Write a protein that binds this ligand. Structure first.
Ligand SMILES: C/C=C\C/C=C\C/C=C/C/C=C/CCCC(=O)O[C@H](COC(=O)CCCCCCCCCCCCC)COP(=O)(O)O[C@H]1[C@H](O)[C@@H](O)[C@H](OP(=O)(O)O)[C@@H](O)[C@H]1O
Ligand SMILES: CC(C)CCC[C@@H](C)[C@H]1CC[C@H]2[C@@H]3CC=C4C[C@@H](O)CC[C@]4(C)[C@H]3CC[C@]12C
Ligand SMILES: CC(C)CCC[C@@H](C)[C@H]1CC[C@H]2[C@@H]3CC=C4C[C@@H](O)CC[C@]4(C)[C@H]3CC[C@]12C
Ligand SMILES: CC(C)CCC[C@@H](C)[C@H]1CC[C@H]2[C@@H]3CC=C4C[C@@H](O)CC[C@]4(C)[C@H]3CC[C@]12C
Ligand SMILES: CC(C)CCC[C@@H](C)[C@H]1CC[C@H]2[C@@H]3CC=C4C[C@@H](O)CC[C@]4(C)[C@H]3CC[C@]12C
Ligand SMILES: CC(C)CCC[C@@H](C)[C@H]1CC[C@H]2[C@@H]3CC=C4C[C@@H](O)CC[C@]4(C)[C@H]3CC[C@]12C
Ligand SMILES: CC(C)CCC[C@@H](C)[C@H]1CC[C@H]2[C@@H]3CC=C4C[C@@H](O)CC[C@]4(C)[C@H]3CC[C@]12C
Ligand SMILES: CC(C)CCC[C@@H](C)[C@H]1CC[C@H]2[C@@H]3CC=C4C[C@@H](O)CC[C@]4(C)[C@H]3CC[C@]12C
Ligand SMILES: CC(C)CCC[C@@H](C)[C@H]1CC[C@H]2[C@@H]3CC=C4C[C@@H](O)CC[C@]4(C)[C@H]3CC[C@]12C
Ligand SMILES: CC(C)CCC[C@@H](C)[C@H]1CC[C@H]2[C@@H]3CC=C4C[C@@H](O)CC[C@]4(C)[C@H]3CC[C@]12C
Ligand SMILES: CC(C)CCC[C@@H](C)[C@H]1CC[C@H]2[C@@H]3CC=C4C[C@@H](O)CC[C@]4(C)[C@H]3CC[C@]12C
Ligand SMILES: CCCCCCCCCCCCCCCC(=O)O
Ligand SMILES: CCCCCCCCCCCCCCCC(=O)O
Ligand SMILES: CCCCCCCCCCCCCCCC(=O)O
Lengths: 219, 328, 278, 45
């Protein structure tokens, strides 16, 4: 009991615990987002337009709210053994390019499969998904120059841009199996910069409000 | 043809199993253990833990970017090193208690120095030569380290120079776990190919390949004798492989477990081994009778790591709940 | 006659004590229930336990014996403690409602400033109000043990303990209902029908939750305060039946065990915590 | 690679099992996890 070194060690442990708790409290007020997509879906351009060799961390500050965006597509490996580490993320931002008919690895089916795997993952039951679509001008030019039956053997319809976009929107939102827990927010990415950040902020706020309501039991 | 010859050689040499020889051996009984101490310092999931050579200081790394070195006697905190990357997958402690390595999703497991004249933790080395997420980097001596990454390669790095001296390749899937033998002359690496390969550090070319699993293998630990090891897989069927015999000896399976394993450890004498499953329970199984000698509870989500001291006094197990339980 | 009432009161007190103790133990013994809302719920459970341990036995003894035989000092202490604890419970309910309002209608504040210190401040404010309206009778101002019937004291207590928090809670919950309905409202035919059905189910769930939360307070507390406000102002008409007076008086005390049942035992996480404890 | 790996000096499986049992029994007296350590000499109490 009457030990000076033991008391000094206890004081050091108390100081370390205080510092750790303070740092945890400081870092707890940060909304985490997980950015996912294909290799060349415009993820880098999207990060650039918001901000203006493995995990890439990006910091955003909009209307007094700190967002930590984690881009993971830099490195390719087995997703089954590190996806679980991203449990609890506020939202998953999935990026898709509309003008993917030209090059065949076909990318549309692969993107659908990836989205289905991510959305139905057992570790993201309560995680919301925000869907971004890129390169509308290229998509419009391609539909003007090429039909839609090439990518969709089992679909026939008009070539109007709005109808095709709505069909793709509905198809993407159709993949999810569970609809009561998670809601998919889909937005069209454009050359503007403020609209994307505003939509991300609105989606995060809606998700937080819905989670709070569910905790209260109203929702 | 050569694989067929190896299969014939291994099947011909097998006439009886370890079960028959262990029939006359009485059971170890019910080994009941209780959590003597509880360490609650982290605020997120802990993914690794390593015991020191003195069985006093152990280092654990969490997902909040913090690794903490605790005094296992008084449950006091002596070092807490903040990290640039919040994602940490593995940690390792030096035999001499001077350097601590921690790595994760980023293609670097940083080595930090504990003993310094100024008395403050500072960055010592940052090895960056891999392209896949680092799985486990282990210390051999004061000047060498091994790294098992997600690129399907095992790299031998020199801390002083910082460049890799030897590279091991041949795995199709990413390697997950790596353990060092007591003599620090050879090790074993496992990957998603449901197989384990022995690698000799001095020369740097493979010796043997062992199969028997159907899913990915997550943990591998040498027997204290150094002539055999145990591997865990997601099929809930841990298997012990002998290097000298080059064939599986016995199977460790039970009908009440359907979930996978996370870590496998041995005892000082090897009579009883420890397995961490996803049922927030630790299983203590007899290494000879192939029976369940003990069940340990007290975890909520999932057991992430477990380790026995070199002296064999106690065993520390850590789960995703952020509580480390010391059974003795 | 006496035996039945005594047994019923004892069973009620035992059930309330068991519920409050179970809530407190579940909150304390587990690390997954350490939240500001859970802290407020635990404070409410502690107040209910205090009511059950200190005030309820005295009231039961007075009711069964039909007279007070513990002295004037003990009667004054009982009255003060009962008033203080009932006010504490009501204001804890109001504080929980206000915290829910802040959480739902302010996401930025929820993310940034949701430290436990806010719960401590709210609890301190509620206890301060309780002491403020409970001390005056001892500081400022034979067999029967009854509260003072002064017009000023009774109006002050009624308006500062029930009516003001009642109106505040009503306004807060109306705003919550408005916000929740706004959020909910905000081959394709099948999808539209499914969405409409889900929205209707969510609206029904919200309506049921609000109705239960409001009723368990109104129908359990309003009659007692109305009686306490009307009786002192009508000295000519004091022929209120004993049975109805007793039932109205004991409804508020019985409310002590419904609050933990509704606020705590209902939400999924807390019952899962119980199941883990078992 | 397989050509060099195949040429190894292999032993009998039963011999390896016997060696493992002998090693396990030799050090069975120094296992705190197996034999409950009394609190007197236990530094974890
Ligand atoms: C108009 C026509 C006529 C119809 C009109 C007249 C009659 C209408 C009556 C309608 C029914 C109303 C009661 C609702 C019952 C009910 O719905 O419960 C169901 C199952 O639960 C149990 O039954 C199990 C509950 C058991 C709780 C434990 C009780 C025993 C503990 C004793 C204490 C001592 C123990 C030691 C479904 O559960 P739930 O929907 O009620 O659950 C919700 C609850 O209602 C919300 O309040 C709550 O919000 P919060 O509390 O404010 O934070 C939500 O989070 C959620 O928990
Ligand atoms: C559960 C523990 C902690 C608290 C006990 C609360 C209740 C059950 C206890 C507290 C005091 C008790 C009362 C004390 C005095 C008498 C007077 C006697 O003539 C009949 C019984 C009666 C009326 C008792 C019945 C039960 C009682 C009301
Ligand atoms: C009569 C007294 C002395 C003994 C019984 C006290 C307690 C256990 C009783 C009194 C009234 C009961 C409640 C009355 C209404 C409901 C609503 C229903 O949907 C779930 C059960 C619930 C919540 C009951 C649970 C048990 C309860 C709280
Ligand atoms: C005599 C009557 C009024 C009953 C009073 C019981 C009160 C004083 C007791 C019952 C259980 C106790 C709590 C049990 C658990 C803990 C958790 C600990 O980390 C801090 C203290 C705290 C929060 C205790 C404080 C006091 C407490 C709330
Ligand atoms: C049975 C348990 C659970 C609760 C205890 C109930 C009874 C016995 C307790 C509660 C509060 C106590 C009183 C508290 C204050 C005083 C004032 C003092 O000047 C004389 C005794 C007196 C009047 C005490 C007598 C016993 C008492 C009435
Ligand atoms: C980690 C920290 C911040 C958690 C905060 C919990 C605090 C707000 C809670 C836990 C239990 C509560 C106490 C429980 C019992 C009593 C006794 C009563 O006569 C006065 C209030 C008092 C003293 C409460 C005040 C607030 C309290 C201390
Ligand atoms: C006469 C004196 C005491 C003033 C009383 C004013 C009360 C009755 C008023 C003030 C605010 C009102 C509420 C404001 C918001 C809504 C939400 C709406 O969707 C249903 C009605 C409801 C719930 C109102 C009901 C009545 C209300 C509670
Ligand atoms: C003193 C105590 C025992 C009285 C408790 C009575 C409670 C249970 C009564 C009072 C008013 C009732 C509510 C009145 C209105 C509705 C709206 C309806 O769409 C669903 C039921 C619901 C939500 C009722 C459920 C039960 C209710 C809350
Ligand atoms: C929810 C609350 C506010 C309802 C209150 C209802 C009260 C005011 C009602 C219910 C029954 C009524 C009593 C019923 C019987 C009589 C007997 C008669 O000879 C004088 C009046 C008297 C004594 C009534 C006075 C008012 C009374 C007590
Ligand atoms: C369990 C709770 C939450 C709801 C139901 C409580 C009811 C059934 C209980 C609680 C206490 C009981 C009262 C206790 C005391 C008396 C006084 C006596 O002279 C007549 C009966 C009367 C008036 C009882 C009638 C029923 C009663 C009012
Ligand atoms: C003094 C202590 C030891 C007594 C402990 C008794 C506890 C375990 C009892 C009392 C009431 C019980 C609960 C009452 C009702 C429900 C709701 C149901 O849908 C799931 C079980 C659950 C949540 C029960 C679980 C166990 C429970 C919490
Ligand atoms: C005679 C009055 C009886 C009152 C009974 C109240 C029971 C309170 C139970 C509190 C349990 C607190 C558990 C603390 C656990 C810990 O040691 O940390
Ligand atoms: C009789 C009622 C006493 C009230 C006791 C309240 C004790 C609060 C404990 C938490 C202390 C944290 C500091 C709170 C500062 C504050 O008052 O706002
Ligand atoms: C003694 C006073 C009796 C009158 C008080 C009755 C209170 C009943 C509670 C009704 C809850 C209404 C819930 C909101 C309904 C709505 O959506 O408008």
């Amino acid at each position: 009991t009457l030990s000076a070194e033991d008391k000094a060690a206890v004081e050091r442990s108390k100081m370390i615990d205080r510092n750790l708790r303070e740092d945890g409290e400081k870092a707890a007020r940060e909304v985490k987002l997980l950015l996912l997509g294909a290799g060349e879906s415009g993820k880098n351009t999207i990060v650039k337009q918001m901000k203006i060799t493995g995990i890439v961390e990006t910091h955003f500050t909009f209307k007094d709210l700190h967002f930590k965006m984690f881009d993971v597509g830099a490195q390719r490996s087995e997703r089954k053994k590190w996806i679980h580490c991203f449990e609890g993320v506020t939202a998953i931002i999935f990026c898709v390019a509309l003008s993917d008919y030209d090059l065949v690895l076909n990318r549309m089916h692969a993107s659908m499969k990836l989205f289905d795997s991510i959305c139905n993952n057992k570790w993201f039951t309560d995680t919301s998904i925000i869907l971004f679509l890129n390169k509308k001008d290229l998509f419009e030019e391609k539909i003007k120059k090429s039909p839609l039956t090439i990518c969709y053997p089992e679909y026939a319809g008009s070539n109007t841009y709005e109808e095709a976009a709505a069909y793709i929107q509905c198809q993407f939102e159709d993949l999810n199996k569970r609809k009561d827990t998670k809601e998919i927010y889909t937005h069209f990415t454009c050359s503007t910069d403020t609209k994307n950040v505003q939509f991300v902020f609105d989606a995060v706020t809606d998700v937080i409000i819905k989670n709070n309501l569910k905790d209260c039991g109203l929702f | 043809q050569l694989k067929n010859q190896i299969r014939d050689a291994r099947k011909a040499c097998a006439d009886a199993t370890l079960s028959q020889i262990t029939n006359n051996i009485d059971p170890v009984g019910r080994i009941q253990m209780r959590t003597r101490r509880t360490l609650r310092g982290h605020l997120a999931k802990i993914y690794a833990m390593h015991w020191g050579t003195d069985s006093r200081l152990l280092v654990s790394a969490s997902q909040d970017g913090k690794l903490i070195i605790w005094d296992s006697y008084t449950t006091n905190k002596v070092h807490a090193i903040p990290l640039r990357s919040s994602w940490v997958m593995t940690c390792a402690y030096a035999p001499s208690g001077n350097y601590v390595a921690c790595g994760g999703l980023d293609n670097i497991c940083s080595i930090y120095n504990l003993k310094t004249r100024e008395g403050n933790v500072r960055v010592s080395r940052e090895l960056a030569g891999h392209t896949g997420y680092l799985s486990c980097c282990r210390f051999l001596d004061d000047n060498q380290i091994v790294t098992s990454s997600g690129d399907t390669t095992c790299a031998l790095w020199d801390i002083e120079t910082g460049q890799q001296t030897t590279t091991f390749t041949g795995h199709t899937g990413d390697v997950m776990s790596l353990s060092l033998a007591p003599d620090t002359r050879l090790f074993v690496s496992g990957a998603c190919d449901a197989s384990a390969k022995l690698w000799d550090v001095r020369e740097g070319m493979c010796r043997q390949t062992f199969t028997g699993h159907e899913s990915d293998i997550n943990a591998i630990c040498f027997f204290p004798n150094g002539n055999a090891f145990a591997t865990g897989s997601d099929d809930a069927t841990c298997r012990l492989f002998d290097l000298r015999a080059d064939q599986e000896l016995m199977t460790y399976s039970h009908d009440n477990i359907i979930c996978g394993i996370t870590s496998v450890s041995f005892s000082k004498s090897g009579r009883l081994l420890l397995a961490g499953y996803d049922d927030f329970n630790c299983n203590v199984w007899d290494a000879l009778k192939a029976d369940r000698a003990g069940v340990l509870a007290g975890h909520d989500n999932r057991v992430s790591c477990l380790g026995v001291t070199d002296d064999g006094m106690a065993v520390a197990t850590g789960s995703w709940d952020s509580f480390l339980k010391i059974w003795n | 006659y006496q035996v039945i009432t005594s047994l019923l009161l004892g069973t009620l007190i035992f059930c309330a004590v068991l519920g409050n103790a179970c809530v407190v133990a579940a909150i304390a013994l587990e690390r997954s229930l350490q939240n500001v809302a859970n802290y407020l719920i635990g404070s409410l459970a502690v107040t209910d336990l205090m009511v059950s341990v200190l005030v309820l036995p005295m009231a039961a003894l007075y009711q069964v014996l039909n007279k007070w035989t513990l002295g004037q000092v003990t009667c004054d202490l009982f009255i003060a403690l009962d008033v203080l604890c009932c006010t504490s419970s009501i204001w804890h309910l109001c504080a929980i409602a206000l915290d829910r309002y802040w959480a739902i209608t302010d996401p930025i504040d929820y993310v940034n400033k949701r430290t436990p210190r806010r719960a401590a401040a709210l609890i301190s404010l509620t206890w301060l109000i309780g002491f403020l309206i409970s001390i005056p009778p001892m500081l400022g101002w034979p067999d029967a043990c009854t509260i003072s019937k002064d017009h000023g004291y009774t109006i002050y207590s009624t308006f500062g303990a029930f009516y003001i928090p009642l109106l505040l809670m009503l306004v807060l919950y109306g705003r919550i209902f408005r916000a929740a309905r706004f959020r909910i409202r905000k081959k394709n035919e099948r999808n539209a029908e499914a969405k409409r059905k889900m929205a209707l189910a969510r609206e029904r769930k919200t309506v049921k939750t609000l109705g239960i939360i409001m009723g368990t307070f109104i129908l359990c507390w309003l009659p007692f305060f109305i009686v306490a406000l009307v009786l002192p102002f009508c000295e000519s008409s004091c022929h209120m039946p004993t049975l109805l007076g007793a039932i109205i008086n004991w409804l508020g005390y019985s409310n002590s065990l419904l609050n933990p049942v509704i606020y705590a035992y209902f939400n999924k996480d807390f019952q899962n915590a119980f199941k883990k404890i078992i | 690679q397989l050509k060099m790996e195949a040429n190894i000096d292999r032993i009998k499986v039963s011999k390896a099992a016997a060696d493992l049992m002998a090693y396990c029994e030799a050090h069975a007296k120094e296992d705190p996890l197996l034999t409950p350590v009394p609190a007197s000499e236990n530094p974890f109490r």
